[PDB]
Amino acid sequence: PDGVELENWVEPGRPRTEGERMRDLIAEYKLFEMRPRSGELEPGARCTVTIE
Amino acid sequence: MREIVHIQGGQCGNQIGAKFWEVVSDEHGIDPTGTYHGDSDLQLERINVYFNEATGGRYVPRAILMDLEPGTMDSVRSGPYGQIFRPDNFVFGQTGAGNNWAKGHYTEGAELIDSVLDVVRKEAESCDCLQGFQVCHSLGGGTGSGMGTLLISKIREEYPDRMMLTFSVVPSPKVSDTVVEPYNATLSVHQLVENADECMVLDNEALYDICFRTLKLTTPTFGDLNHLISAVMSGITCCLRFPGQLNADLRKLAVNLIPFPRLHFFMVGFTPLTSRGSQQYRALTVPELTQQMWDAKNMMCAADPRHGRYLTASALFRGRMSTKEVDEQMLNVQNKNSSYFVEWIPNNVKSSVCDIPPKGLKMSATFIGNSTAIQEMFKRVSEQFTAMFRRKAFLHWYTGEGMDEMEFTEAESNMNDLVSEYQQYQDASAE
Amino acid sequence: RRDAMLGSLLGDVIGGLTDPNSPLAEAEAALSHADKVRRKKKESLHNE
Amino acid sequence: RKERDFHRMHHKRVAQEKNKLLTDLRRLKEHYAKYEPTILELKKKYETLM
Amino acid sequence: RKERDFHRMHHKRVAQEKNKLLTDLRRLKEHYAKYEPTILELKKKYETLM
Amino acid sequence: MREVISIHIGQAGIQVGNACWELYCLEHGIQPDGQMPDDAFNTFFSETGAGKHVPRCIFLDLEPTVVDEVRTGTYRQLFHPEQLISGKEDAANNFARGHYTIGKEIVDLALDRIRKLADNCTGLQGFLVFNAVGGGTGSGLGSLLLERLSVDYGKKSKLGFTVYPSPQVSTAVVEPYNSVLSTHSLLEHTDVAVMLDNEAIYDICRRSLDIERPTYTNLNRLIAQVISSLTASLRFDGALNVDITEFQTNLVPYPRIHFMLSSYAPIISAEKAYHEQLSVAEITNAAFEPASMMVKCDPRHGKYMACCLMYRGDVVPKDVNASVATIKTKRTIQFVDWCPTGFKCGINYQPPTVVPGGDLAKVQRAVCMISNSTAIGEIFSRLDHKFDLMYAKRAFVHWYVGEGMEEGEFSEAREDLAALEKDFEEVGAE
Amino acid sequence: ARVGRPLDPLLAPLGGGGTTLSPATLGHPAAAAAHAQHVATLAANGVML
Numbered sequence A: 001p002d003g004v005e006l007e008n009w010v011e012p013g014r015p016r017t018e019g020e021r022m023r024d025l026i027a028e029y030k031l032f033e034m035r036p037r038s039g040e041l042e043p044g045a046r047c048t049v050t051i052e
Numbered sequence B: 001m002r003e004i005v006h007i008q009g010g011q012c013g014n015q016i017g018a019k020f021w022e023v024v025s026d027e028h029g030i031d032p033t034g035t036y037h038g039d040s041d042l043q044l045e046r047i048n049v050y051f052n053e054a055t056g057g058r059y060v061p062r063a064i065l066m067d068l069e070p071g072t073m074d075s076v077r078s079g080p081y082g083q084i085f086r087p088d089n090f091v092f093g094q095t096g097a098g099n100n101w102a103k104g105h106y107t108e109g110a111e112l113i114d115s116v117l118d119v120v121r122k123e124a125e126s127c128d129c130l131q132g133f134q135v136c137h138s139l140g141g142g143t144g145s146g147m148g149t150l151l152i153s154k155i156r157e158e159y160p161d162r163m164m165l166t167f168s169v170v171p172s173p174k175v176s177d178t179v180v181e182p183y184n185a186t187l188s189v190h191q192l193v194e195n196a197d198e199c200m201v202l203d204n205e206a207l208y209d210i211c212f213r214t215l216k217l218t219t220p221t222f223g224d225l226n227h228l229i230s231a232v233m234s235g236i237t238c239c240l241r242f243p244g245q246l247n248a249d250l251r252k253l254a255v256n257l258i259p260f261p262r263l264h265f266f267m268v269g270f271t272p273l274t275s276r277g278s279q280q281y282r283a284l285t286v287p288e289l290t291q292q293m294w295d296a297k298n299m300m301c302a303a304d305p306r307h308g309r310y311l312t313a314s315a316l317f318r319g320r321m322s323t324k325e326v327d328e329q330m331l332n333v334q335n336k337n338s339s340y341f342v343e344w345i346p347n348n349v350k351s352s353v354c355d356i357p358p359k360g361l362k363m364s365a366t367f368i369g370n371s372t373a374i375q376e377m378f379k380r381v382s383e384q385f386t387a388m389f390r391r392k393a394f395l396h397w398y399t400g401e402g403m404d405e406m407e408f409t410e411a412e413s414n415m416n417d418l419v420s421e422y423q424q425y426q427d428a429s430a431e
Numbered sequence C: 001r002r003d004a005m006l007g008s009l010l011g012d013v014i015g016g017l018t019d020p021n022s023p024l025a026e027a028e029a030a031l032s033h034a035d036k037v038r039r040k041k042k043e044s045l046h047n048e
Numbered sequence D, E: 001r002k003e004r005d006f007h008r009m010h011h012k013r014v015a016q017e018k019n020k021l022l023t024d025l026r027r028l029k030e031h032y033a034k035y036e037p038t039i040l041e042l043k044k045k046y047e048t049l050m
Numbered sequence F: 001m002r003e004v005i006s007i008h009i010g011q012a013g014i015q016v017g018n019a020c021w022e023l024y025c026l027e028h029g030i031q032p033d034g035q036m037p038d039d040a041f042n043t044f045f046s047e048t049g050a051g052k053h054v055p056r057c058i059f060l061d062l063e064p065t066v067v068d069e070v071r072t073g074t075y076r077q078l079f080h081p082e083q084l085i086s087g088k089e090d091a092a093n094n095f096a097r098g099h100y101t102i103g104k105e106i107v108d109l110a111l112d113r114i115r116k117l118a119d120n121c122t123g124l125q126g127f128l129v130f131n132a133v134g135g136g137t138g139s140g141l142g143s144l145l146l147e148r149l150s151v152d153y154g155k156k157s158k159l160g161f162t163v164y165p166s167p168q169v170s171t172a173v174v175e176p177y178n179s180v181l182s183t184h185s186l187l188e189h190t191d192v193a194v195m196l197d198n199e200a201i202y203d204i205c206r207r208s209l210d211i212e213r214p215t216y217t218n219l220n221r222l223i224a225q226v227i228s229s230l231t232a233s234l235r236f237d238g239a240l241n242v243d244i245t246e247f248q249t250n251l252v253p254y255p256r257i258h259f260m261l262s263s264y265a266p267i268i269s270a271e272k273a274y275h276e277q278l279s280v281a282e283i284t285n286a287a288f289e290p291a292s293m294m295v296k297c298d299p300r301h302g303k304y305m306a307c308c309l310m311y312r313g314d315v316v317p318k319d320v321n322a323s324v325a326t327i328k329t330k331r332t333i334q335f336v337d338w339c340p341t342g343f344k345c346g347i348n349y350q351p352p353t354v355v356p357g358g359d360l361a362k363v364q365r366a367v368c369m370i371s372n373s374t375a376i377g378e379i380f381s382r383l384d385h386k387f388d389l390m391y392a393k394r395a396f397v398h399w400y401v402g403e404g405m406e407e408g409e410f411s412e413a414r415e416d417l418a419a420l421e422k423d424f425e426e427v428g429a430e
Numbered sequence G: 001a002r003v004g005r006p007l008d009p010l011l012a013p014l015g016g017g018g019t020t021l022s023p024a025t026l027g028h029p030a031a032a033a034a035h036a037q038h039v040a041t042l043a044a045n046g047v048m049l
């Protein structure tokens, strides 16, 4: 998601392509997740991003 | 030869259907015993649309009366036209639903729905050609709205291509009869959007306003409202039953009316509705009838057309008239009120003319308007449902009927989505 | 000829009933995915 | 906002048409799964008669 | 702008899914049409073998 | 020996056929029962051994009411019962419904009866297809039948007397849609297509018949008079006999450009009759008046390409030549540079018969002008915007898709009417 | 007699027309195939016209 509000809009359908279905199961079961997402930093700051 | 199967559901639906059958039989010259007494060939020419011939000359209406409590059917049978209906078409339970849509859709409707569909299939298979089914009932009630949505879903599953016409009495804006009206309305609208191909919104307070301001009646009982609704329900299909200069069946009306599938809710009004005092003072002309037609007060639905935008509008006229006259009148209306009309549809008029006007009236006309104004009615029902669902008041009676709480969110989401398409096609710009 | 065409049609029908790659298989995959999506949206909307 | 509304309504009515196609597919599947057991029974009778 | 880009992409995706579903529905109609002659053929073979 | 097979499709087609057959029966003296108290009827009727003359017509419709009106009306013993073909479910203003799902069996039975009718004709001048562009039955079933006739009968000249939607006034909502679709269909099948607009005929009735109260019966009566004037040379002899085959060769410059304005003169009530001379010159000028057409299309925007005049009654060739020479010397009338002659005069000695109960007066002279002009592209230009305005949101597209139509069909139809616009532009241009 | 134009520059892509009485040869097979394939590509890509 790109910060967009979904309101009774169907999820992406059956991809029928293996790469896209891998991406979609990743999305469904939260396999890869980065916590901070967007950030902003002053010069020399430290963000401490986490990817799990 | 294109048959229609009528179903009357709930107390309000059963009363409206009984009034409708009284009106139709009187129009076709049928006495309450079923024998023809009209002395007119055209009346019997297409009598098969609503009636079947019995062993003798008796004509049995193709009506199915449905209820959970026997009192409404006892009153209907004791009424003036209660003996025309076949007794096997009276499908009633023993315990009524206490204004519980969950009771009328899950617990008590499940047992009776088998008999209901059995009677429906028996009535439909006898028909040579089936235009479809018309179900008359009221939103905001347990038994009626509940099994009405259930039966509409079942008949949609059985006959996907056949026409579905629904006449739902939406709960009134200002004065509400039962507390659980917004729950029932929200649950029923969810089913009607998905299943009913063509659906009508009617409001009791709009009925009172029109009968008090136009008809100028003093003591309007529910019988008068049922009479007006019956007149509209006859005029919607008089083209099927009588020869017309420019005929239009239910499917033609649906095609010319529904721009997008989910926006199939329509409002009606009937012309000429004249007070007894000013009947002599009025003039029966197409410009008069159209001016009354396009008035907000003539609309049988609470929402006023001025707030919204007319997506489409069909007008089924009845009587000996000029198709030139009618087309000029409605084109002039569109040009004059082009602000209220959607721009990306060059013509918002579906005009049909029938050669047989109703009895007593030299000319008449029914109006079916698909306008974005009904957005405000859906919004008001949402403003009630959301407020009372925020505290889950009387949610628990429905929770007891084996239906999930998530279904209320489902219905609200679908209803407000429909609100969204109404608003956006109201404010949609060409190109 | 009748035996050959009967066998061909019987094989086609039985394969459609039970094949890993059959039009019924794609139909059920699509409809099951649609049902799962609807259930997930509705439960998620209720939770939200 | 105008562009967003345009692309919105396009996406929504395409999705509605997809859902209708899904419903029609369900109806056809039921209508012919009604037929299939007769084929199965006739196959069984065929085998027994051989 | 984010909403319009989002809805453009999903409109395209659902249109592609609709086309795929249309092709699948055509194939399914073909297979369903293949069903009904099989009953008659099996009945004729049943009678002849009997 | 000069038989012409009549087909009437949809409500408008059947309702104009009612007037057409009333007019032909009155013209040849054929009573409603079927028989009349030489061989001038053979073009429209086939006589049986009993003396009863049955029309060589076919009433095709998917709606039963219109055909049942004929089966019940005064003309129940005249028409052949199987010739009246009735459907079960109406096309519901859906071209896909009338062309893909409902219309198949109906058109098959229609061609069965059409073959039976054509076997009974020694010669066959052609077909007269009367349908309603702007409705599923007329559009879809009419298009399917026209394709079917073009494929099987082949070189028989088919005259399609189509009614297109008026510019501003209309009665249907998907009327631009199905009109574009049926024009897409009939651009390649009909040999000569006659354009009609309800608004224009309404204006004619309002202004010249002084009918403030126009209706479909009057419109259909006027159309029937136009067609009877068109066919008068097949049934009645006269100087400058013009044939059905001669129409297209004298009227169609290029294969696609075969749509035709039709104009009758005079259109005057019995009251206003015998207040004017109604000479040949005056009636010809009235016919060439921009206002007098049965289509809402001003010639002054375009240029005339061909004009075939059919005169009926006491008309002399010097008078027709003098009137047409004055028309040519008139500055308002403008022809294309590449057609110096552009005039096909034909006369007949049979004055137009008047239907009792009608408004048209008994005039000893009549002119039917059928003209190919580049102006007519304007009406197609109107529909080409009416179509794409809705097609931007693709409203009502789901209805057409449901009965086996694809978005490609709509796109191709729009492309085709754009191509027709370009054809009219290039025929107009030098 | 069947007549075709062998010297017409514009009719050369078709090959003189004529009758081409075989069903696969009827009309404009190449043009129809190209147009249908292009429409199919647009529909499969979801590029609405």
Ligand SMILES: Nc1nc2c(ncn2[C@@H]2O[C@H](COP(=O)(O)OP(=O)(O)OP(=O)(O)O)[C@@H](O)[C@H]2O)c(=O)[nH]1
Pocket (backbone or CB within 6 Å): B245, B246, B247, B248, B252, F009, F010, F011, F012, F013, F015, F016, F061, F063, F090, F091, F092, F093, F094, F098, F132, F133, F134, F135, F136, F137, F138, F139, F163, F171, F172, F175, F198, F216, F217, F219, F220
């Ligand atoms: N001139 C003229 N036009 C008519 C008349 N009756 C109907 N029309 C036109 O015919 C159009 C539609 O014709 P049809 O397709 O035959 O209508 P239908 O018989 O109900 O068939 P569908 O609408 O396709 O279901 C309408 O838009 C009218 O404008 C008539 O009597 N005279």
Ligand SMILES: Nc1nc2c(ncn2[C@@H]2O[C@H](COP(=O)(O)OP(=O)(O)O)[C@@H](O)[C@H]2O)c(=O)[nH]1
Pocket (backbone or CB within 6 Å): B010, B011, B012, B013, B015, B016, B097, B099, B138, B139, B140, B141, B142, B143, B144, B145, B169, B171, B176, B177, B178, B204, B222, B223, B225, B226
């Ligand atoms: N027009 C009309 N409306 C009615 C009548 N009886 C009840 N209603 C309305 O219908 C609404 C719903 O009631 P209903 O569904 O019939 O109750 P239920 O049968 O127990 O489900 C109520 O708000 C009433 O105002 C009647 O006879 N005529």
